[PDB]
Nucleic acid binder design. Sequence first.
RNA 1: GACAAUGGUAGGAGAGCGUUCUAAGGGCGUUGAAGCAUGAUCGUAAGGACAUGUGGAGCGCUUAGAAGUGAGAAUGCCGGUG
RNA 2: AAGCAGUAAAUGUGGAGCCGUAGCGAAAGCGAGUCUGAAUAGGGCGUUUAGUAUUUGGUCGUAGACCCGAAACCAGGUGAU
RNA 3: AGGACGACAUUAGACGAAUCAUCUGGAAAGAUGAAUCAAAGAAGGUAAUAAUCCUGUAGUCGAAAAUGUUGUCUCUCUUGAGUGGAUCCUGAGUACGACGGAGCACGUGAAAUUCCGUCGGAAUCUGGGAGGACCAUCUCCUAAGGCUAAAUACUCUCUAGUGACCGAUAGUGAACCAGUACCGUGAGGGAAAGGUGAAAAGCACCCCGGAAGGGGAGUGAAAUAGAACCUGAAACCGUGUGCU
Lengths: 145, 204, 64, 61
Amino acid sequence: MKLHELKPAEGSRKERNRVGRGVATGNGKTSGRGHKGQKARSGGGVRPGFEGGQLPLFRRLPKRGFTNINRKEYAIVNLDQLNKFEDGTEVTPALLVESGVVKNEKSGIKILGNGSLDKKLTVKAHKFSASAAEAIDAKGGAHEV
Amino acid sequence: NYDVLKLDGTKSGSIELSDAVFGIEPNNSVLFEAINLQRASLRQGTHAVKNRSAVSGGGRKPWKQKGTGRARQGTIRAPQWRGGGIVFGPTPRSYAYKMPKKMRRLALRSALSFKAQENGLTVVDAFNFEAPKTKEFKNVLSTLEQPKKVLVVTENEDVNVELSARNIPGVQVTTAQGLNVLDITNADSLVITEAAAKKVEEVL
Amino acid sequence: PKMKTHRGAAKRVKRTASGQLKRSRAFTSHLFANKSTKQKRQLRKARLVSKSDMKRVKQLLAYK
Amino acid sequence: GKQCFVTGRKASTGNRRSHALNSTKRRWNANLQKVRILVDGKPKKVWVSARALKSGKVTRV
RNA sequence: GACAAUGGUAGGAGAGCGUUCUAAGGGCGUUGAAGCAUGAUCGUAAGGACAUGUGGAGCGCUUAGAAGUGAGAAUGCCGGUG
RNA sequence: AAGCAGUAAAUGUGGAGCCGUAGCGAAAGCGAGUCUGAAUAGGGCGUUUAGUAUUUGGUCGUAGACCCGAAACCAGGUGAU
RNA sequence: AGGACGACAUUAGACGAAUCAUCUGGAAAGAUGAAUCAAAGAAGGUAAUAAUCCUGUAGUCGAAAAUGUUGUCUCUCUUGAGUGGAUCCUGAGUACGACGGAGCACGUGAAAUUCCGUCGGAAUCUGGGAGGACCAUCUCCUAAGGCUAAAUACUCUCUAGUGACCGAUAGUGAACCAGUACCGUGAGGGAAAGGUGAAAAGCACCCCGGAAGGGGAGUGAAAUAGAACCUGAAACCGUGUGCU
Ligand SMILES: [Mg+2]
Ligand SMILES: [Mg+2]
Ligand SMILES: [Mg+2]
Ligand SMILES: [Mg+2]
Ligand SMILES: [Mg+2]
Ligand SMILES: [Mg+2]
Ligand SMILES: [Mg+2]
Ligand SMILES: [Mg+2]
Ligand SMILES: [Mg+2]
Ligand SMILES: [Mg+2]
Ligand SMILES: [Mg+2]
Ligand SMILES: [Mg+2]
Ligand SMILES: [Mg+2]
Ligand SMILES: [Mg+2]
Ligand SMILES: [Mg+2]
Ligand SMILES: [Mg+2]
Ligand SMILES: [Mg+2]
Ligand SMILES: [Mg+2]
């Protein structure tokens, strides 16, 4: 491309709409605000969720539940993701991070049964699904917590 | 396969430049974004106006609200007033934006590829200058038969080459690291030293 | 600045997989004598926030 | 400008709270009592807080 | 080629005109730039030329970028003159 | 990302962090399922792919937030020619 | 607390490459042709738009004196380590508690942690404090005495620069003898107002007129550039005229 012949990609750029710039635009005068009322005013409107004095939804409905301080979340790897590793490879939490199967470790790595393991592997993980453990054993791989 | 020419203009040999770096079909969409981004970064954005609050005075209400027969007014520094504050004028800001790294690398390759396609890429064995002389460099460009706007690329900063070519109009000297989309796009031709060409190929 | 979440709504709703909001049910605090067993049993089961309600309150729970 | 000579204890500011949690600024003053004590080896009357006077830390002339 | 639609307020959608600045390219100007004035010119509109007078040194065009980007009314503000 | 280098640049480097790849449940927890339930019943929410980064446009929030206009409120001063 | 010597920097400066001719014009930097320099083609000025005319620029050089920074000597100050478990020491009206407040993102709450007023009031290394009521355990610290650079904030100011910032109703209120004129008892409020020409060459002289003002003459490229003297819109006010 040349600086005298620069061209944007098609659909990449559209011009902005300018209100209060004459009738022919269709956004002159009222500027798309209609006629009078609270919202026609500058900085005019209602806070989102305000229903004009009717009890709001998030006041009429009840609060529920609590958050556990000791809640543990495990990074989950399905059987299909383990397939990438060559048969007989020792799958470990460290390897998974290096492979890029897991980015954030969280509390630990938990193997889950979704998908099918097609390669025999020695898998070491903090937790395993019942299905996952059986699938690794079926391939002849050994699962270790 | 690009021929390497001595500064005299006689062929020194042949260098191979990677197809990915200098052969990819140019992406004009990415290239446009890169050029726009670089131009935005150059902007200073030091532009300011004074709003009604900023303008001097204008605290007191000019006259009583009713009875005068005048229009109701609250300050002499209101926007409709002469010497009044500016409503929503320019404010100091940055125009700089970022794009993904992969696209930045593509834009460079696309610009370099465009050069190679137009025969704008010339490879020279080396630029050897003991001292800075503009006339000598001007002769080199004439022997190389380079156009008015030329980008000379060195592997690493060369003091003599930069000094020599500084005052020549249309000629810009860069290093392989310093290569940018604007410079490559602006230049009609690119003269790259053999060492620089390899370094560019390695980087991109 | 950063937009602020509506803390009361966050305390009262949970987000599903499809981006819907699970909600608890009103009329479940007291006065259970005045309510039927079928009412009480069915009011126990949760519902989703309505589409019309979502339109009004979607920005309140963007971060949720 | 009234403080304990020994401890430097002085009035503090805070809020008076109603049952409705309405707040009005108030002061807590030190229990300062004018007592003759030895200052610079000469008997002098100065304001001293009762806390300081307790345990005979401040001699009274 | 055939035939079908095209009144319109709030309002939604689209395509454009013009202004100032910037980049790049290519141009104009004391053998007269911009501005101003006049005319029987051109385009579907916003608007664009051309000639002449005045003027006396800057200014278009193409493409892209960015906006203090368009006034007839606010008992609007300031100035001038009825 | 901050940072660091660089020309107030592009850019390079920086993987901390963020989002997605799994959901369900108040939670313990379990997992292509989970919760409810005595249920292996029924039902709710899920599974049987596409996201993410930057940016044009639209809209919203927070900022005076399209522009002009009160009567008033408060604080500190100045006044008994 | 000082001293000596050196270096660097700041506060004046110096040198610093390269163009002539022709055409138009009042004037050349323009155009045209032929050259030249460049570590200098930033910029401003010069009778129109100049890398080579001027001031400069790159580069290089320079300080009697004063100041700052810094280096090296000098000077000043000064022991550094183990082993032992008997005894001693290790910050008290303190910690802490109650009550009333406040501060902690945390509205008295289950309220830890931390401050204040009032009142009461420990322990002592087998001590004491903390880990969000509290207790036990475990773990980490060692209050109630001080000092401490850098990374951080800001800009009245100075120096050098920059702007897809303004260009005289804009930009500072203020491009100008402006916080002035003016207004107010005072606190205080608060304007308007830039442009002859390249050069002043700023109209000798003559004519009308008391003067003002004007007509010539002359200066100038231009006076329809003659003094708030570039350009000179509209409103508005006239004079004449074709049609009515
Ligand atoms: Mg449009
Ligand atoms: Mg309409
Ligand atoms: Mg209108
Ligand atoms: Mg209206
Ligand atoms: Mg109505
Ligand atoms: Mg309405
Ligand atoms: Mg009237
Ligand atoms: Mg102003
Ligand atoms: Mg229509
Ligand atoms: Mg629209
Ligand atoms: Mg405007
Ligand atoms: Mg010279
Ligand atoms: Mg000449
Ligand atoms: Mg208390
Ligand atoms: Mg605890
Ligand atoms: Mg002004
Ligand atoms: Mg003007
Ligand atoms: Mg003014």
